Amino acid sequence: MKRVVLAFGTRPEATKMAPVYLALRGIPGLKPLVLLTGQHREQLRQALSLFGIQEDRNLDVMQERQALPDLAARILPQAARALKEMGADYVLVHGDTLTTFAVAWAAFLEGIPVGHVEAGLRSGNLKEPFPEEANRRLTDVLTDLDFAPTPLAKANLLKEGKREEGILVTGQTGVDAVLLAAKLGRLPEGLPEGPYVTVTMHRRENWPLLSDLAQALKRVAEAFPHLTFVYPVHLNPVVREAVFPVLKGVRNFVLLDPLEYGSMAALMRASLLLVTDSGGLQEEGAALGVPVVVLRNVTERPEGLKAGILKLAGTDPEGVYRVVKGLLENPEELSRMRKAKNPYGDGKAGLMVARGVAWRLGLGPRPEDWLP
Amino acid sequence: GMKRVVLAFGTRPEATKMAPVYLALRGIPGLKPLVLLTGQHREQLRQALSLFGIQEDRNLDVMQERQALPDLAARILPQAARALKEMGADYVLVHGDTLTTFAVAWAAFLEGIPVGHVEAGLRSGNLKEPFPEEANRRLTDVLTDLDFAPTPLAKANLLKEGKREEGILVTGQTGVDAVLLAAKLGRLPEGLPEGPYVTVTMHRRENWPLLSDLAQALKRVAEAFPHLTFVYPVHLNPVVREAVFPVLKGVRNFVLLDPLEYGSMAALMRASLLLVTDSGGLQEEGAALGVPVVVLRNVTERPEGLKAGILKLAGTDPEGVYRVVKGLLENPEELSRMRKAKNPYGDGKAGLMVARGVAWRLGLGPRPEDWLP
């Protein structure tokens, strides 16, 4: 039995790796194992529990901020020992954290092949993001197999000296993850009957406009009394103090505290539309086929704005009210959005990663690139 | 100067190639070079830097015992970051492909200090061979602000890894500068007869069994040139001495010495009309000094030298060696052409180019022009 160790330390990483773990379990001759490398073991176990996954080993790390050189030095030796003791035949890492490179380097120094999930993304500037851009580039120098989420990612890797045979375009495992989480998660309790409209103004950008936006949300809720608007506020002093004094009295509105990945996925899934200012929650909406209205007017990947998935409602208070209201009064246009083709993946990226690993371990054939 | 440039290295070979850079930096207004030793033999490296008149400014704390790679890197990283920050480094220069070199470069990067990589770009194209050196150099170059490539080929390798043109400078080898410096600072062996001299060196293990025959050929050469003194620092290996001593001891114009130090040997070669050797390393040293070299081999371990006309092959047949060496010593024009041949490794000023490259990055001067082969 070949052992494949997935090493990660944050909840976002855990959710993106869960589909990979699940697909590996379905391959004969392979056994997936999880090595936690972060802080907050309870939070990670909770995140993994949504998918019925428990870790196999945990590294010993400090619970607060540590100087980067000290963090790397603390992870390296531990990681090398953990990977050898776990009997790893292959190691999968994800993302661009310092911890991720340290684990990849430990594996390489121990002669264990490394696969990098969601690899190839580049800014072209080592000073931004710091030290993430360097972390991912360093990690890719050592990778046996790069799992690029897009054709562009593959192009980047090819310009850095990576061989085509060592690159597999898989699409985003995040797509697989949210689709599954939507089914596994449970809606917030106590919520009224639907239809629902999920609202989440997370971005710390619109600090001032936050109030005006809330005023617009109140008026749209009045324009749609037969619709329930669920809004999980970040219980932040600056945020709460700006939205609650405006929405608290709206019987049509439901204010909740931050939700967990599974619950938020289920809520979005059970919603007719998503109103947000977060790029992350916009991509999840795309995978779920849920229409999204971004409270912006530019920036980001026009991939989704390439018609379908999302639409911009600008920052203008009155403009937003009209954009959203116009949509909720146009459901059949919202139907055109839900049927939009997902440009981020087919929900089988996790399976492709697992098959790629099986191929490297001589257990199966090389899968073919995912095509948008 | 106001800006501080830390050169971090931990082995004698690295110190030798970095010395020319250190001295060139000391000559640039607004810059002050500093040395951070990163190896296991402080006193040993300390003495090596002595020849060049360089002292270290700080040393990392490294175990003497062998250690697993992950543990070594972990041991180096934190203290390196702290040392570079406490030394107030505005720029860091590293050399080589060791694990420590990458650990230092990563420490500098994490502290936000630009890093320059000397003699960068050489690749094997295989992460398994050499291990972990190929990985070490590729990792180091991901983080480098300026790569100083010894050759156009090295530059081509760097571009192939995503490095941008503006971030690469072809400098030639600082090793050339080092020999010239060592020759100038060194002193010839004591009590030598009045010159001219011919330096002789034979120690290629494969030539071992031919040493007696080759020594006899050299004895014939010495007898044919009574006015020249042949100086031969003989290696300590008893096998070598049993072969050469009985033949060359007692030869009037042959001087047999014990192995010389880097500087003393460079000085001897510089004072010689010709170098006779079977060593690739010494052949390259002769070329740095513009000293004609005759190689006692049937083929060269590098085509560059032969192509450049800096060396002549004499083969290993005794009669042939005599004919070639005697012929060359009686052909002043051929010897002259060899001394005037363009060195295919560097122009002896690679250190100055590296120094100017750093000054340019720090906004203290224009970008130097690339060395041309």
What domains are there in chain B, each with its CATH number? 1-188+346-373 (3.40.50.2000), 189-345 (3.40.50.2000)
Instruction: Identify which of A192, A172, A180 has the alpha carbon closest to the alpha carbon of residue A266.
Output: A180
Opening angle at CA B118, ends B113 and B122, nearest 5: 125
- Compute the nearest-CA separation of B71 from chain A (Å): 6
AA identity, residue A122: R
- Calpha distance A183→A200 (Å, rounded): 21
Range A183-197 burial, b when 16+ CB lie within 10 A, else e? ebbebbeeeeeeebb
Look at phi and psi of residue A65 and say left if phi exceeds 0, alpha if psi is from -120 to 50, else beta.
beta
Instruction: Give the number of C-alpha atoms closer than 13 A to the C-alpha of residue A104, restricted to the C-beta side.
Output: 29
Are B26 and B54 within 8 A, CB to CB? Answer: no
In the structure encoding, which two tokens stand for residue B162, read together? Answer: 């995503």
Which pairs from B122-126 meet CB under 8 Å and 24+ separation?
B122/B150, B122/B154, B122/B157, B123/B157
List CB contacts of A261: < 8 A, sequence separation 6 or more.
Answer: A11, A15, A47, A50, A181, A185
User: Does B127 sit within 8 Å of A109, measured CB to CB?
Assistant: no
What is the three-state SS of B319-364? HHHHHHHHHHHCCHHHHHHHHHCCCCCCCCCHHHHHHHHHHHHCCC
Instruction: Identify which of A270, A264, A263, A258 has the alpha carbon closest to the alpha carbon of residue A193.
Output: A270
Nearest by CB to residue B132, choosing from A72, A109, A159, is A109
In the structure encoding, which two tokens stand for residue A87, read together? Answer: 């009997």
Number of Cβ within a 10 Å radius of residue A362: 8
Q: Which helix (H) or strand (E) holds A43?
A: helix A41-49
Number of Cβ within a 10 Å radius of residue A44: 23
Q: Determined by which method?
A: X-ray
- Calpha distance A131→B107 (Å, rounded): 12
Q: Would you say how long chain A is, in residues?
A: 372
In the structure encoding, which two tokens stand for residue A133, read together? Answer: 């851009």
- Calpha distance B57→B83 (Å, rounded): 10
A141 touches chain B (CB under 8 A): yes
Chain B hits for A138, CB-CB cut-off 8 Å, are: 106, 139, 142-143
List CB contacts of B336: < 8 A, sequence separation 6 or more.
Answer: none
Q: Does A202 participate in catalysis according to the annotation?
A: yes
Instruction: Give the number of C-alpha atoms closer than 13 A to the C-alpha of residue A326, restricted to the C-beta side.
Output: 10
In the structure encoding, which two tokens stand for residue A368, read together? Answer: 């073919």
User: Does B143 sit within 8 Å of A141, measured CB to CB?
Assistant: no
Are B351 and B28 within 8 A, CB to CB? Answer: no
In the structure encoding, which two tokens stand for residue A32, read together? Answer: 């997936």
> How many Cβ pairs within 8 Å bridge chains A and B?
73
- Calpha distance A201→A272 (Å, rounded): 17
Verify cis geometry, omega within 30 degrees of 0, for the bond prior to A195.
yes
DSSP state of A39: S
Number of Cβ within a 10 Å radius of residue A60: 8
- Calpha distance B361→B18 (Å, rounded): 18
B308 touches chain A (CB under 8 A): no
- What residue spans of B144-251 are helical by DSSP H? 152-159, 174-185, 211-224, 238-248
Instruction: Identify which of B165, B166, B167 has the alpha carbon closest to the alpha carbon of residue B141.
Output: B167
Are A81 and A110 within 8 A, CB to CB? Answer: no
Chain A hits for B80, CB-CB cut-off 8 Å, are: 69
- Calpha distance B10→B188 (Å, rounded): 28
List CB contacts of A242: < 8 A, sequence separation 6 or more.
Answer: A210, A211, A214
Resolution (A): 1.8
- Calpha distance A55→B58 (Å, rounded): 44
Are B366 and B195 within 8 A, CB to CB? Answer: no
Q: Which residues pair with B276 in a beta bridge?
A: B200, B294
DSSP string covering B98-120, please? Answer: -HHHHHHHHHHHHTT--EEEET-
- Compute the nearest-CA separation of A365 from chain B (Å): 24
Verify cis geometry, omega within 30 degrees of 0, for the bond prior to A225.
no
Backbone angles phi, psi at A34, to 5 degrees: -120, 125
Q: Would you say how long chain B is, in residues?
A: 373
User: Does B138 sit within 8 Å of A106, measured CB to CB?
Assistant: no
Number of Cβ within a 10 Å radius of residue B280: 16
Backbone angles phi, psi at A5, to 5 degrees: -95, 125
- Calpha distance B354→A279 (Å, rounded): 45
Number of Cβ within a 10 Å radius of residue B245: 14
- Calpha distance A104→A91 (Å, rounded): 8
Q: Does A110 participate in catalysis according to the annotation?
A: no
DSSP state of B57: S
DSSP state of B266: H
Q: Does B206 participate in catalysis according to the annotation?
A: no
Chain A hits for B86, CB-CB cut-off 8 Å, are: none
Nearest by CB to residue B77, choosing from A69, A80, A142, is A69
Instruction: Identify which of B243, B357, B177 has the alpha carbon closest to the alpha carbon of residue B368.
Output: B357
Instruction: Identify which of B195, B121, B125, B174 has the alpha carbon closest to the alpha carbon of residue B152.
Output: B121
Q: Does A132 participate in catalysis according to the annotation?
A: yes
Are A198 and A271 within 8 A, CB to CB? Answer: yes
Strand order in the sheet with B197-200: B254-257, B229-233, B197-200, B272-277, B293-295, B311-313
Breaks (C-N over 2.5 A) in chain B follow: none
- Calpha distance B230→B234 (Å, rounded): 12
Distance of CA A179 to the CA centre of its chain: 12
Strand order in the sheet with A310-312: A253-256, A228-232, A196-200, A271-276, A292-294, A310-312
Q: Does B147 participate in catalysis according to the annotation?
A: no
AA identity, residue B145: D
List CB contacts of B327: < 8 A, sequence separation 6 or more.
Answer: none
Number of Cβ within a 10 Å radius of residue B324: 21
First to last CA, chain B: 33
- Calpha distance B338→B347 (Å, rounded): 15
Pick among A65, A75, A138 to test the B interface (most B CBs inside 10 A): A138
Q: Does A234 participate in catalysis according to the annotation?
A: yes
In the structure encoding, which two tokens stand for residue B206, read together? Answer: 């494969």
Number of Cβ within a 10 Å radius of residue B331: 11
Would you tell me which residues 48-77 of chain B have a C-beta closer than 8 angstroms to some C-beta of chain A? Answer: 68-71, 73-75, 77
Breaks (C-N over 2.5 A) in chain A follow: none
Q: Which residue of B has its CA nearest to A138?
A: B139
In Å, how far are A167, A244, A245, B268 from A236, measured between CA atoms?
Answer: 43, 11, 13, 78
- Calpha distance A179→A287 (Å, rounded): 7
User: Does B135 sit within 8 Å of A142, measured CB to CB?
Assistant: yes
Identified catalytic residue from B71, B161, B187, B205:
B205
Are B203 and B278 within 8 A, CB to CB? Answer: yes
- Calpha distance B23→B11 (Å, rounded): 18
A134 touches chain B (CB under 8 A): yes
Backbone angles phi, psi at A33, to 5 degrees: -135, 150
- Calpha distance B166→B158 (Å, rounded): 12
